[PDB]
């Protein structure tokens, strides 16, 4: 409600479904999908022009409005950190007679600029850290909302207030110009931005309305990968533990188990950046257990029954749990595909969290029918060796312990039963 522009995918196109029937021109250089995602590149013809309807009556000038959208901003090039930090570029422009708003990016900053008839210019921005071992923001879908009052220009991220500027010094802003979606500034030939669900409202939205909107635009039947795109069957993925962020799974040498190693890090000499490597450890692949069920698309849904496979020695291997583990946690068995009575191979994929998340849980069961729970896949510190000094070592494991900890509310984000799946993505190079 109060919505005055609402860009949505429809028949190989973007259209205003606000109910005010704006004209939208998508040029040949914009990539679209039925997931409502669209891509702006460096190309001259990667642009969208939106003309607001001029046969219906709207405000000539206005300073009580809001802009909502999701964005996915690719990681800096390691050898391009100078240009990234310094070179500001517009992504969305709405200016008639040298006044109105624009959205722009300078490296790890997203910037909201107002300009009045007089030419007074005020900005509010949101900067994310590019020294984090694992960023919540770099190359990942997140939710932006910018509200405007007479007093305050606010930026909310994933439903939470983050930045505030005083804009009482600005009285008059023209908000009825053409909205041009286009990368405009000294960008690299390879620069691009993904956006979805771009909306404009004729009101300043409450924090409550922004958080309800974050939760609804986040909800799906289907699970999501590390980047925030839909999780897929038959797709190569690396595995991230949300509970042990700097951990990764590797097949132990001459042993059919998964040892947990520490992620390698950014090794070059830039003082401005640091990250943990993401494209390390075993390459996993998700398979549907059943083909007799209806499987029109390759999208992984909550409560689906899967096999969890990985590649070893140019062969597809599988993750099993031993059937008879008396202990509270056991090392998983990583071995070729095999009908063996001594091991379970069936996983149900769960979402125990009720807040928006990209994490999922992996529940071993007897059969698709059996109603009893064996344990959740996680990580555990096991006794390795020593009598005087005791060596302990992390292994890829199952645990009954997790079954009780997933029931506690608010959901414990720190549990090692919380996994994300990371495919190779052009927006992350290391």
């Amino acid at each position: 409600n109060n919505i005055i522009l609402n860009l949505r995918y429809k028949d190989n196109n973007l259209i205003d479904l606000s109910g005010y029937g704006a004209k939208v021109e998508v040029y040949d250089g914009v990539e679209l999908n039925d997931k409502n995602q669209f891509k702006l590149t460096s190309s001259a013809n990667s642009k969208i022009r939106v003309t607001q309807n001029q046969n219906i009556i709207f405000n000539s000038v206005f300073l009580d409005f809001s802009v909502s959208f999701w964005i996915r901003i690719p990681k800096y090039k390691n050898d391009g950190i100078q240009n990234y930090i310094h070179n500001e570029y517009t992504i969305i422009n709405c200016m008639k007679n040298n006044s109105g708003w624009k959205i722009s990016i300078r490296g790890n900053r997203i910037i909201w600029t107002l300009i009045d008839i007089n030419g007074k210019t005020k900005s509010v921005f949101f900067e994310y850290n590019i020294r984090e071992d694992i960023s919540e923001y770099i190359n990942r879908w997140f939710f932006v909302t910018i509200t405007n009052n007479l007093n305050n220009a606010k930026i909310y991220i994933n439903g939470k207030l983050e930045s505030n500027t005083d804009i009482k010094d600005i009285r008059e802003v023209i908000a009825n110009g053409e909205i041009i979606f286009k990368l405009d500034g000294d960008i690299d030939r390879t620069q691009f931005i993904w956006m979805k669900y771009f909306s404009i409202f004729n009101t300043e939205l409450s924090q409550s309305n922004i958080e309800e909107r974050y939760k609804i635009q986040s909800y799906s039947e289907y699970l999501k990968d590390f980047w925030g795109n839909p999780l897929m069957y038959n797709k190569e993925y690396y595995m991230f533990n949300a509970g042990n962020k700097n951990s990764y799974i590797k097949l132990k040498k001459d042993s059919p188990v998964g040892e947990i190693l520490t992620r390698s890090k950014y090794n070059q000499n830039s003082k401005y950046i640091n990250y943990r490597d993401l494209y390390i450890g075993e390459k996993f692949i998700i398979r549907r257990k059943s083909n007799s069920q209806s499987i029109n698309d390759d999208i992984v849904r909550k409560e689906d029954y899967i096999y969890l496979d990985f590649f070893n020695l140019n062969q597809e291997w599988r993750v099993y749990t031993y059937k008879y583990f008396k202990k509270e946690e056991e090392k998983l068995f990583l071995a070729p595909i095999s009908d063996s009575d001594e091991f379970y191979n069936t996983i149900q994929i769960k979402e125990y969290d009720e807040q928006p998340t990209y994490s999922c849980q992996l529940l071993f069961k007897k059969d698709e029918e059996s109603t009893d729970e064996i344990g959740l896949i996680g990580i555990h510190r096991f006794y390795e060796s020593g009598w005087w000094f005791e060596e302990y070592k992390d292994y890829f494991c199952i645990s009954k312990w997790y079954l009780k900890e997933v029931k506690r509310k608010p959901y414990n984000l720190k549990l090692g039963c919380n996994w994300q799946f990371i495919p190779k993505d052009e927006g992350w190079t290391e």
Partner: peptide, 16 residues
């Protein structure tokens, strides 16, 4: 073959 049987044996060695 029983290459899988040699891994099941190594797995049993691994978890005590």
């Amino acid at each position: 073959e029983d290459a899988f049987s040699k891994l099941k044996e190594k797995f049993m060695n691994e978890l005590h």
